[PDB]
Design a protein around this ligand. Structure first.
Ligand SMILES: *C(=O)/C=C\c1ccc(O)cc1
Length: 125
């Protein structure tokens, strides 16, 4: 397993060295999006939670297609502001409930080290 704690201050630095293979070792969900909400990476842990297939969601809009239950001021609203500002680091509780059992999780959004990429870290609570 890759030893990285959810909410770690330097998490964007640590994860810059990973690949899809290495990301699959994390204890929590991790989604990498571009400036437009498109999925660039999708680890095995978020798949265990949402039931999605990582390899099948890659390339689709996170907010439009895959997870419309996030299209909201509380989530998407926060993402867009972050993207436009060029900085993003917020943590909140959300309920995943689209075509799945209503699941309470902890969501950590943070801008990555790379120019135009954003992290979505998730964990059951
Ligand atoms: C609501 O849709 C919230 C979360 C979520 C995340 C990923 C996937 O694939 C579905 C739903």
């Amino acid at each position: 397993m890759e030893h990285v704690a959810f909410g770690s201050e330097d998490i964007e630095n640590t994860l810059a060295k990973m690949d899809d293979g290495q990301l699959d070792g994390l204890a929590f969900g991790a989604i990498q999006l571009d400036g437009d909400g498109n999925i660039l990476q999708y680890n095995a842990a978020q798949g265990d939670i949402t039931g999605r297939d990582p390899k099948q969601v890659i390339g689709k809009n996170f907010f439009k297609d895959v997870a419309p239950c996030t299209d909201s001021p509380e989530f998407y609203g926060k993402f867009k502001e972050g993207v436009a500002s060029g900085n993003l680091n917020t943590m909140f509780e959300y309920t995943f409930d689209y075509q799945m059992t209503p699941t309470k999780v902890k969501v950590h959004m943070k801008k990555a080290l790379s120019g135009d990429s954003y992290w979505v870290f998730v964990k059951r609570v």
